[PDB]
Write a protein that binds this DNA or RNA. Structure first.
Lengths: 86, 59, 326, 64, 56, 34, 487, 231
RNA sequence: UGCGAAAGCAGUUGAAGACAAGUGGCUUGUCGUUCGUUAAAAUGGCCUCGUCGCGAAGG
């Protein structure tokens, strides 16, 4: 369940979360990466955010919102945006 | 690890101090070393349960 | 052994001025003898003090150092006020004042006069047949600047205007350590390493009495009229001679013996007591440097006295927020 | 008493304060003391509060 | 010759309002953080934190 | 209360009993050392 | 903060035969080892100065056992007839054995190859012999020559004292344990005698008459002695010269006694007795010689003895039966040099290490972790016990909700609740919790009772169990009524 | 003279340190005690000697706060999970730091720590910080006074040791830097006056099994400052 | 809600206002609204501290 946000250059861990409770199986984002939506095998799909300007000045992620939606699992996820659909 | 296993190196010219850490010094199995902030005291604590205290004359 | 290098009581027993070592410097300090701690360090290890004395109009200390200076140092203000000097870099071995007249011996056998109201040198002179010097004392006969008493391994009563030796006493087999004038004619002396005090007439050279103690001495303190002299011995005891100028006929044994034993069975040493009329200011190092005191009533305690003090030895740290069973 | 570090949304818990909490905030010079105003609701008769503050070191109480 | 005499203290008596304040605590620490000044309905206690007595 | 008086209690809950140059140098040093 | 309250275990309330500490201390005597012998185990004595050995007296064969391992360690079999009395000297060094030929022999301990000396007693069987308690070198032998004698073992040739004055079958001796000049004997006409050894010793200075022929005379104090004959034991006091207690709680004649003082027990003094019936019973000389506990063996117990006051190891009760065997019921009592420093000379010592609690139960940590249905499920596992199940049921009643603990069940997991409740409804202390628990489960699961067929037979025989229990409680209420009549 | 002459010790002296202004040499070992000598040339004596039963102390060190210079804490940690904080103002009380807040599965032990200052970069609230060796690749920092978690940085491999650089920015304002080694030789240096993210990572030219790193020459743990601008 | 015994005894239940929703009016619901009568429903549940020989800038 440890959703970990690694830095790309210098190749190490920017921050971490032990948010989930079991196997995380998939995740996604949007087109300019203010959100990361993770979803695992205990069906709790939750959304980490970077929306505020000071949080993107620090470029640090919060454990913003949670949602349970399902009966048994999640095994895949996807996201889409437009100017008429998201 | 071994007995009498401490050395001091002169840092700007990175030389090694020859005369002091000789076999007539009772360093013992050295397991801690610490400098004083201003007096130039040098404490070396060994495994047998004591700490000897040298003084550097230059400081 | 003491980490206090050397200490001196003020007259009328109120403040103890003591110098200890603290990481190759000299932590000097003044402590009241009923919390005074912000007192100075000098610079490096090659500037240690050698003698010190009070001056009681402000109140101050003089520190005869070893580099060649005397430092007149205030106590209320923390800084050194003035730096008396000779022209030589030689080690001042003892200093003694009398009113305004100050007098310091050297280690290179000289004598220097000074005055702490005009702040300048007066006379700069040596004499023959005094090959080492480590004590001197201006004599009390009012403003008797003349006829001072120098002392090293034998005691020489020397004039300041005839400027030569007028009497010579036999000293010890060691360099002298304590020489103090107790009357207008008697002075006590005693070297270190030996247990023998001898008092001398200043007008005959006859050793009137010999005081003995159970160890060699560190410092003596007499009363205001020479009827009680308390020495501190090197094994950390206090020996008080009562009425030492009466007549057990030539050599007086010690009368009062006060030693301080804590309530865990550990002997703590006593250095530099002070006895005015019917009190006793016993001083002792509780922790490694900070000293404590006791104002003991002097004439009423028995012949020996084990003063008890409390000290942490195995006390369970009961907290202010926990209980006994945790 | 639940204190939540916000960078992971994770808690440290103090389990039982013999009373419900009404007001609590930090009050140190840099945040080394936690005030607490607890109320002890198991009697519905009186409004009998209980003041305590406690240092953040090991969460031990001080002067209830 | 009897008399009544108040001897002992009561409840701490905070700002007991009906949600008119979210800061329902009027105790205080001194700026030397060693003394807790706390009002009562009957007293004004001053405690010392390292000893936990009513220091005045 | 068995010390031969009485103790009552309020509801504004209080309790009550039915009852029957060295000195100047030392002062300046204590001032200046702080 | 504070600590966590330990989940209590509400045990059985005040049922009769309540657990008293004397019967606790005697109850912890376990491991009754039974050892065969060849004939009736007549006499058993113990080792005084190192209480670690005891001597048993079979026919023609005296054995000594040790208390550390409880096996036979030495024998003594140079006996020309049946051997009767085995006793020890008070320095624990020499064993005196009176046999039936009359040549009463004393060996030393652990060396049966050397008979130390053979006292020639009378032609009659020397039935009891024992050493003096105070003095070492005087030895009392009573034969059935209606007489007893005191021998000095140094001057072993002649009777030092000739104590006559007893009529029929002198059988026991005991010495008054403060004044060593007072020797107490018993005979088979009653009339417990005692003599002053400084006197001529041919008549008792005062006699005490147990009406039954006395079987054992022991001393428990300088003041009072204990003599037994018939189916009762009687305590006499010498200062009042009078019988002052008698207990008769047996069937047949009591055959041996002894006493133990100041040993490790809540009961200070203890006098135990063997009774030829199958029972050995302990009596408490503090509170008027009441019975306290009794062990039952498989035949007429002919002698018994307990380990002495200072046994320092495994403490023993032993009893030789006349059937030919023996019962032993026992009770049993260079880099890390500084890491044991433990703070001797250092100034200030700080100590706040919390002791580790004993390991919490599965249901205890389940209720503490609030998983209530899992607490109930791990509670009704057949590896648990009755009081533990009753206390977790009481806990879920008092704190949580039984509705919550049953809000997610089905046909399957509701079975072991009722299956426990069948056994639980019948007894006393559980039936209220059984009652409201099955009441709330049938309140909450009525439609599943309509659908599912399995627990219907559980409800049926629960109805039968309730009818059986209401019949039993109704007749018990009738007994309560007739006791209210008889008061 | 021998610094352990007036009072004998009993285990290996596992850590020595000095008070950064006062003449006190602090000594601690595996005999679950910690003494503090007052030291000079001819002699040296004991001042206090606290003794913690149950717990050894693998490393123990002074700490003075930079702002007020009147805190004088002792931070003593052994092979267990807790470290102990002593306050010095002249019996005596201590506190038992034992609560990692969010991250309890990353501290097998408090076996190695350091102590370092930090100015908080939006206001000049200079406070101390203890820094712990992790178990996988972590290094947690904490708060010296309160005991909050602040952040935990992490490298790969094994954390073997680490050291604390300082660097000034303006008058009376400084940013610290934690330098931490791998067990292979590439080290990470990240500042932590902002949140702890890596500002440089570089490889030791050679070196395989590396075991200790120490920076200095300016100010560090063995010689901190007392004025803030003396950094 | 009142009495009283741990059981039971006698009796409440409205008026107005605001706001919302749904079908300009009209139906339904909530009250950090007033007077008067003694009158279930946000995946959210309680921490660690049981842990692992000697030898003062050579012999």
């Amino acid at each position: 369940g440890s959703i970990k946000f690694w830095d790309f250059q210098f190749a190490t861990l920017n921050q971490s979360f032990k948010a989930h409770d079991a196997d995380v199986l998939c995740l996604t984002t949007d087109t300019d990466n203010n959100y990361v939506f993770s979803a695992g095998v205990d069906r709790k799909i939750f959304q980490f955010s970077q929306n505020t300007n000071k949080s993107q000045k620090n470029n640090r992620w919060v454990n913003s919102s949670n949602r349970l939606l399902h009966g048994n699992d999640i095994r895949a996820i996807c996201a889409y945006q437009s100017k008429g659909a998201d | 690890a071994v007995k009498d296993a401490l050395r001091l190196v002169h840092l700007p010219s990175c030389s090694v101090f020859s005369n002091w850490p000789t076999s007539g010094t009772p360093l013992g199995k050295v397991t801690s070393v610490a400098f004083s902030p201003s007096g130039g005291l040098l404490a070396v604590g060994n495994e047998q349960g004591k700490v000897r205290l040298w003084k550097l004359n230059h400081y | 052994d003491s980490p206090v290098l050397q200490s001196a009581y003020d007259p009328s027993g109120q403040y103890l001025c003591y110098v200890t070592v603290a990481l190759d410097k000299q932590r000097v300090g003044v402590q009241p003898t009923q919390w005074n701690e912000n007192f100075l360090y000098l610079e490096d290890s090659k500037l240690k003090v050698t003698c010190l004395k009070w001056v009681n109009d402000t109140v101050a200390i003089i520190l005869g150092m070893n580099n060649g200076e005397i430092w007149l140092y205030s106590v209320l203000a923390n800084e050194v006020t003035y730096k008396f000097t000779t022209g030589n870099s030689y080690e001042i071995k003892d200093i003694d004042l009398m009113g305004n007249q100050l007098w310091c011996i050297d280690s290179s056998d000289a004598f220097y006069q000074f005055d702490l109201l005009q702040f300048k040198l007066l006379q700069h002179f040596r004499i023959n047949n005094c090959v080492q010097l480590n004590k001197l004392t201006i004599v009390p006969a009012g403003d008797s600047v003349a006829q001072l008493l120098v002392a090293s391994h034998s005691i020489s009563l020397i004039d300041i205007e005839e400027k030569k030796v007028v009497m010579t006493f036999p000293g010890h087999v060691s360099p002298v350590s304590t020489l103090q004038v107790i009357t207008n004619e008697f002075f006590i002396s005693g070297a270190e390493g030996d247990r023998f005090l001898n008092v001398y007439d200043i007008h005959s050279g006859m050793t009137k009495c010999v005081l003995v103690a159970e160890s060699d001495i560190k410092e003596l303190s007499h009363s205001g009229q020479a009827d009680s002299i308390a020495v501190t011995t090197e094994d950390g005891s206090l020996e008080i001679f009562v009425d030492p100028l009466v007549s057990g006929n030539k050599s007086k044994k010690s009368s009062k013996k006060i030693q301080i034993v804590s309530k865990d069975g550990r002997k703590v040493p006593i250095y530099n007591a002070f006895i005015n009329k019917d009190l006793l200011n016993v001083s002792w190092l509780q922790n490694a440097t900070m000293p404590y005191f006791k104002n003991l009533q002097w004439r009423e305690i028995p012949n020996e006295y084990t003063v008890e003090i409390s000290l942490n030895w195995n006390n369970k740290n009961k907290s202010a927020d926990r209980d006994l069973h945790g | 008493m639940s204190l939540w570090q916000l960078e992971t949304n994770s808690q440290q818990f103090l389990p039982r304060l013999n009373g419900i909490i009404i007001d609590c905030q930090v009050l140190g010079p840099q945040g080394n003391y936690y005030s607490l105003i607890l109320q002890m609701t198991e009697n519905n008769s009186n409004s009998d509060y209980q003041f305590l503050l406690l240092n953040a070191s090991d969460l031990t109480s001080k002067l209830s | 010759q009897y008399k009544l005499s108040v001897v002992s203290g009561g409840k701490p008596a905070l700002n007991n309002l009906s949600s008119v304040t979210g800061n329902k605590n009027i105790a205080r620490l001194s700026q030397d953080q060693r003394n807790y000044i706390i009002p009562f309905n009957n007293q004004i206690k001053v405690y010392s934190v390292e000893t936990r007595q009513c220091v005045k | 209360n068995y010390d031969t008086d009485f103790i009552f209690l309020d509801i504004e809950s209080t309790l009550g009993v039915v009852g029957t140059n060295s000195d100047i140098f030392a002062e300046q040093l204590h001032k200046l050392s702080s | 903060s504070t600590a966590r309250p330990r989940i209590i275990t509400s045990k059985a309330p005040l049922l009769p035969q309540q657990t008293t500490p004397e019967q606790r201390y005697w109850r912890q005597y376990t491991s009754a080892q039974l050892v065969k012998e060849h004939n009736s185990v007549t006499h058993i004595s113990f080792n005084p100065q190192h209480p670690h050995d005891f001597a048993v007296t079979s026919s023609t064969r005296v054995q000594i056992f040790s208390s550390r391992t409880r096996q036979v360690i030495k024998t003594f079999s140079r006996f020309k007839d049946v051997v009767y009395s085995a006793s020890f000297r008070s320095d624990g060094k020499l064993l005196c054995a009176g046999d039936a030929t009359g040549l009463v022999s004393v060996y030393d301990s652990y060396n049966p190859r050397t008979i130390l000396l053979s006292i020639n007693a009378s032609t009659h069987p020397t039935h009891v012999t024992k050493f003096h308690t105070q003095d070492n070198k005087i030895l009392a032998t009573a034969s059935d020559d209606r007489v007893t004698r005191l021998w000095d073992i140094s001057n072993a040739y002649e009777p030092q004292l000739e104590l006559t004055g007893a009529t029929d079958y002198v059988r026991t001796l005991s010495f008054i344990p403060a004044a060593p000049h007072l020797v107490a004997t018993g005979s088979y006409d009653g009339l417990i005698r005692l003599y002053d050894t400084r006197s001529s010793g041919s008549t008792p200075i005062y006699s005490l008459n147990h009406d039954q022929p006395v079987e054992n005379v022991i001393a428990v104090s300088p003041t009072q002695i204990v003599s037994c004959g018939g189916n009762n034991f009687k305590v006499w006091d010498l200062t009042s010269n009078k019988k002052l207690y008698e207990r008769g709680n047996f069937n047949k004649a009591v055959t041996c006694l002894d006493y133990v003082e100041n040993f490790d027990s809540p009961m200070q003094s203890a006098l135990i007795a063997s009774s030829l019936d199958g029972h050995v019973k302990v009596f408490d000389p503090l509170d008027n010689f009441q019975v306290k506990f009794g062990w039952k063996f498989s035949g007429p117990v002919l002698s018994c003895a307990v380990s002495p006051s200072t046994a320092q190891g495994n403490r023993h009760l032993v009893a030789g039966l006349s059937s030919g065997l023996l019962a032993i019921r026992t009770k049993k009592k260079r880099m890390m040099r500084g890491s044991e420093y433990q703070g001797d000379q250092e100034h200030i010592i700080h100590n706040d290490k919390v002791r580790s609690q004993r390991r919490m139960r599965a249901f205890e940590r389940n209720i503490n972790q609030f998983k209530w249905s899992e607490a109930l499920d791990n509670a009704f596992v057949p590896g648990m016990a009755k009081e533990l199940t009753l206390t977790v049921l009481q806990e879920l009643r008092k704190r949580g909700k039984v509705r919550v603990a049953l809000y997610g069940r089905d046909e399957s997991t509701l079975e072991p609740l009722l299956n426990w409740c069948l056994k639980g409804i019948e007894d006393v202390r559980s039936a209220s919790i059984v009652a409201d628990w099955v009441a709330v489960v049938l309140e909450l699961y009525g439609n599943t009772l309509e659908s599912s067929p399995v627990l219907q037979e559980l409800m049926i025989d629960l109805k039968t169990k309730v009818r059986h229990e209401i019949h039993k409680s109704k007749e018990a209420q009738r007994i309560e009524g007739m006791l209210q009549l008889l008061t | 003279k021998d610094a352990n002459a007036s009072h004998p010790s009993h285990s290996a002296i596992q850590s020595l340190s000095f008070h950064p202004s006062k003449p006190l040499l602090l000594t601690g070992g595996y005999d679950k005690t910690l003494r503090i000598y007052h030291i000079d040339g001819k002699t040296n004596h004991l001042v206090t000697s606290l003794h913690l039963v149950g717990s050894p102390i693998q490393t123990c060190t002074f700490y003075t706060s930079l702002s007020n210079q009147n805190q004088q804490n002792i931070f003593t940690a052994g092979r267990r999970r807790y470290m102990h904080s002593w306050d010095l103002s002249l019996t005596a009380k201590i506190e038992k730091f034992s609560r990692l807040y969010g991250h309890e599965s990353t501290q097998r032990s408090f076996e190695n720590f350091k102590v370092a200052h930090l100015q908080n970069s939006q206001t000049n609230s200079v406070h101390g910080i203890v820094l712990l060796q992790g178990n996988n690749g972590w290094i947690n920092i904490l708060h010296s006074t309160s005991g909050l978690w602040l952040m935990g940085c992490k490298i790969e491999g094994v954390i073997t040791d680490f050291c604390i650089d300082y660097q000034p920015i303006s008058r009376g304002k400084f940013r610290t830097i934690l330098i931490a080694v791998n067990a292979y030789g590439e080290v990470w240096e990240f500042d932590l006056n902002k949140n702890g993210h890596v500002i440089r990572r570089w490889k030791d030219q050679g070196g395989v099994g590396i075991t200790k790193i120490q920076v200095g020459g300016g100010t560090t743990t063995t010689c901190p400052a007392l004025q803030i601008s003396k950094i």
